[PDB]
Ligand binder design. Structure first.
Ligand SMILES: *[C@@H]1O[C@H](CO)[C@@H](O[C@@H]2O[C@H](CO)[C@@H](O[C@@H]3O[C@H](CO[C@H]4O[C@H](CO)[C@@H](O)[C@H](O)[C@@H]4O)[C@@H](O)[C@H](O[C@H]4O[C@H](CO)[C@@H](O)[C@H](O)[C@@H]4O)[C@@H]3O)[C@H](O)[C@H]2NC(C)=O)[C@H](O)[C@H]1NC(C)=O
Ligand SMILES: *[C@@H]1O[C@H](CO)[C@@H](O[C@@H]2O[C@H](CO)[C@@H](O)[C@H](O)[C@H]2NC(C)=O)[C@H](O)[C@H]1NC(C)=O
Ligand SMILES: *[C@@H]1O[C@H](CO)[C@@H](O)[C@H](O)[C@H]1NC(C)=O
Ligand SMILES: *[C@@H]1O[C@H](CO)[C@@H](O)[C@H](O)[C@H]1NC(C)=O
Ligand SMILES: *[C@@H]1O[C@H](CO)[C@@H](O)[C@H](O)[C@H]1NC(C)=O
Lengths: 422, 101, 51
C-alpha cells in the first residue's frame, strides 16, 4: 500500500515550542519511516492540528476537517471534555480513536472504536490498595486535586468496607499551589500516610510547601499516583529519610528502551527550562511516552493488513469507513513490547488492564526499585534491603511448661462439673 | 434559526452542545446537573437544577443534626462521587466515619 | 565539632539524629549559620521537635 495518513489533534501552546505529545507523535512517525524493518514498503505521514483543549466545538471541527481530507486514525485530543466529543465522531464514522489520556468513561457508553494506552485507574487503584496493606497502614489521608479525582480512586474509596483503613479524603486548594493552609490542617491530625493524586507538576508544587512546612521527616510516607516520579528532582529530599513510594511504567532498565530517551532529549535539545519548579530534565513524561507507544501499536495493525486506502469521509454525510470493523480488531487484539512493557487491551473495553509496573521508592542512594506489581500476580517485592542486612531479633517466651502429672486423690483428682472442660 | 436550546440532559451530550452554543452565541439552558470541568472557559449557559454543591451542605447539616457517627453513603454510578464530594470530605473536620459502597 | 572548613556537615547531622539530640546550641558565625541550616533542612531535622 501507500502513504496511510494518520491524524493528530494537539494543544495550543501559543508561541512556544510544540507540545510534548506532539513531538512524541512526530518522533515516532519519523522513526518508523526511517526504520525499514518495521513497515517496509509503506511510508507514514502525519497530520497534526491545534485546539484549545477546552472548546469541543473546535475539537469537533478539526476532527471533521481531518476526516474530510482523510485520516487512518485519531491520536486523541488528550483532554476529558474534548476527547468525548471526538470519540462520538470517530465511532459514528468508523475510524478508530487511539487515546493516551485518561478520560471519564460514562457507564452507558455503548462505544467500541477507541483504545486508551493510558493504564486505567481501576487497575491502578487496586495497586495502591495493595501497597497500603503491604505497609500495614490503618490511617491514610488521600489527597486529590480536582473533582474528577474521586472517580480515579473509587476503588480506593470503597476499600474500608472490607478492611481497616480509615480514609480522611482531602482536596487541595483550587488552582493555586499555596497548600499551606491544607498542610497546617494535616499536621494537627497526625496524618502520616498521605496518598497524593496530583500530576507531576503539582507533585513538585506540594513538596516545596511540604518541606517548608516541617513535614519531611522519617515519620511521613508519601505515595503518589503519578507515573512520573522518576522525572522529579529529589536532591533536596534524598537525605531527609522520607518515604516517597510510587509507580513508574517507563522501563528505563532496558538498553533499547533507554537509548530512545537520550535520543529523545537529543531531538528535544531545548527542554524549556524552569529551575525553580523542582523538576529535572524532561526525561520523556508518560503523556509523551505513551504516544511513542501509540504509533507502534497502530504500526502492527497496518503491518498485518495491507488493504487500507484512506478515503474522504464527510461529517454531515456520515457513512462508516470500509474496513473500520476489520482494522479495529487488529488494534484491539494487538500486542507490542514497547516502552511501557507489554501492550494489550481489554477485549470488552480496549482499556489497558494488564500491564507491568515498577514500585520504585526513595532511598538515600536515589530513587530505586523495591518491587514489581502485576495485576495477575500482585506485589513481588524485592524486600531484601542489604544496605543493613541484620534487622531485628525476637524474644523467647512462655513455652507453657508441660507438667507431667498423674491423678491421685486428694492431689490431682477430677472435677464433678456437669459439662465438658478444656 | 433558534433562540434557546433546552438541555439535552446528559453529561456527555450536553458538553458537546455547550461548546457549539458557546461559539454561535445562542444560550443553552440546562435542567440537569452536569460535571462542569474546573476550567471550561464558558459563560453562555445556565443550569436550572439545584446544585449538588449546596445540596451537599444540606445533607451535611442534616446528618450532624441527627448526630450520626457511622454513615454508610451508597452511590449507584461513578459520577455520584462528585455529586457528594462535600460529604466525602466531611471526616476531615468532624467525627463522622464514612464507609462508601 | 563541625568538620574542618567545608560546610558539608551532613556526616555530623547523621550522627545527631541517631542520638535524638533535640536542643542544639550552635556556635558558628552568621556565615556558617546559613551554611548549616541548608544542610539541616535537607536532613530531616527542621521540625517542631528541635530547638
Ligand atoms: C477488563 O479485563 C478484566 C480481566 O480481563 C475483567 O475482569 C476484571 O479484572 C480482574 C480480573 O478478573 C478482577 O479483579 C479482581 O477483583 C476482586 C474483587 O473482589 C470482589 O469484588 C466484588 C465484591 O466487593 C465482587 O462483585 C467481585 O465479583 C469480586 O468477587 C479482587 O479481590 C481480586 O483479588 C485480588 O486483587 C489484587 C490482585 O489483582 C490483590 O489485592 C489480591 O491478590 C486479591 O486477592 C481481583 O483483583 C475484576 O473484578 C474484574 N471485573 C471488573 C468488573 O473489573 C474486566 O471485567 C474487564 N473490564 C473492565 C471494565 O474492567
Ligand atoms: C523509608 O525511608 C527510610 C530512610 O530513607 C528507609 O530506611 C533505610 O533505607 C536504607 C536504604 O538505602 C537502608 O540501607 C537502611 O537500612 C534503612 N533503614 C532502616 C532503619 O530500615 C526505608 O527503607 C524506607 N522504606 C521503604 C518502604 O522504602
Ligand atoms: C528497527 O527495528 C528493528 C527491529 O528490532 C531493529 O533491529 C533495528 O535496530 C531498528 N533500527 C532503528 C534505526 O531503530
Ligand atoms: C516490498 O514491495 C514488494 C513489491 O512492491 C512487496 O511484494 C513486498 O511485500 C514489500 N515488503 C517487504 C519486502 O517487506
Ligand atoms: C518474584 O521474582 C523472583 C525473582 O526471580 C522469583 O521468586 C519469581 O519470579 C517471583 N516470585 C513469585 C512468587 O512469583
Amino acid at each position: 500500500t501507500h502513504v496511510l495518513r494518520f491524524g493528530g489533534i494537539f494543544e495550543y501552546v501559543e508561541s512556544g515550542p510544540m507540545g510534548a505529545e506532539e513531538l512524541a507523535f512526530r518522533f515516532a512517525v519519523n522513526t518508523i519511516n526511517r526504520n525499514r524493518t518495521l513497515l517496509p514498503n509503506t511510508t507514514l505521514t502525519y497530520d497534526t492540528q491545534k485546539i484549545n483543549l477546552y472548546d469541543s466545538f473546535e475539537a469537533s471541527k478539526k476532527a471533521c476537517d481531518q476526516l474530510s481530507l482523510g485520516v487512518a486514525a485519531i491520536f486523541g485530543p488528550s483532554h476529558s471534555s474534548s476527547a468525548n466529543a471526538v470519540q462520538s465522531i470517530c465511532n459514528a464514522l468508523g475510524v478508530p480513536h487511539i487515546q493516551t489520556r485518561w478520560k471519564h468513561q460514562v457507564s452507558d457508553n455503548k462505544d467500541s472504536f477507541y483504545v486508551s494506552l493510558y493504564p486505567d485507574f481501576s487497575s491502578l487503584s487496586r495497586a495502591i490498595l495493595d501497597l497500603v496493606q503491604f505497609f500495614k497502614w490503618k490511617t491514610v489521608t488521600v489527597v486529590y486535586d480536582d473533582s474528577t479525582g474521586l472517580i480515579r480512586l473509587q476503588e480506593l474509596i470503597k476499600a474500608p468496607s472490607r478492611y481497616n483503613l480509615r480514609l480522611k479524603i482531602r482536596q487541595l486548594p483550587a488552582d493555586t499551589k499555596d497548600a499551606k493552609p491544607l498542610l497546617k490542617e494535616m499536621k494537627r491530625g497526625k496524618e502520616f500516610h498521605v496518598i497524593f493524586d496530583c500530576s507531576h507538576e503539582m507533585a513538585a508544587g506540594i513538596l516545596k510547601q511540604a518541606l517548608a512546612m516541617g513535614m519531611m521527616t522519617e515519620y511521613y510516607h508519601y505515595i503518589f499516583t503519578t507515573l512520573d516520579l522518576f522525572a522529579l528532582d529529589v536532591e533536596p529530599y534524598r537525605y531527609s529519610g522520607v518515604n516517597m513510594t510510587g509507580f513508574r511504567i517507563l522501563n528505563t532498565e532496558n538498553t533499547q528502551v533507554s537509548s530512545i530517551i537520550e535520543k529523545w532529549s537529543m531531538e528535544r535539545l531545548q527542554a524549556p527550562p524552569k529551575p525553580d519548579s523542582g523538576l529535572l530534565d524532561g526525561f520523556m513524561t508518560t503523556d509523551a511516552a505513551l504516544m511513542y507507544d501509540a504509533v507502534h501499536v497502530v504500526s502492527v495493525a497496518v503491518q498485518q493488513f495491507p488493504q487500507m486506502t484512506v478515503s474522504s469521509l464527510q461529517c454531515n454525510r456520515h457513512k462508516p469507513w470500509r474496513f473500520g470493523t476489520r482494522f479495529m480488531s487488529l488494534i484491539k487484539e494487538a500486542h507490542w513490547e514497547g516502552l511501557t512493557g507489554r501492550i494489550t487491551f481489554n477485549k470488552t473495553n480496549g482499556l489497558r488492564t494488564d500491564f507491568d509496573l515498577d514500585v520504585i521508592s526513595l532511598k538515600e542512594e536515589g530513587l530505586e526499585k523495591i518491587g514489581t506489581w502485576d495485576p495477575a500476580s500482585g506485589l513481588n517485592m524485592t524486600e531484601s534491603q542489604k544496605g543493613k542486612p541484620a534487622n531485628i531479633t525476637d524474644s523467647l517466651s512462655n513455652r507453657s511448661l508441660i507438667v507431667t502429672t498423674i491423678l491421685e486423690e486428694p492431689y490431682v483428682l477430677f472435677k464433678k462439673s456437669d459439662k465438658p472442660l478444656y
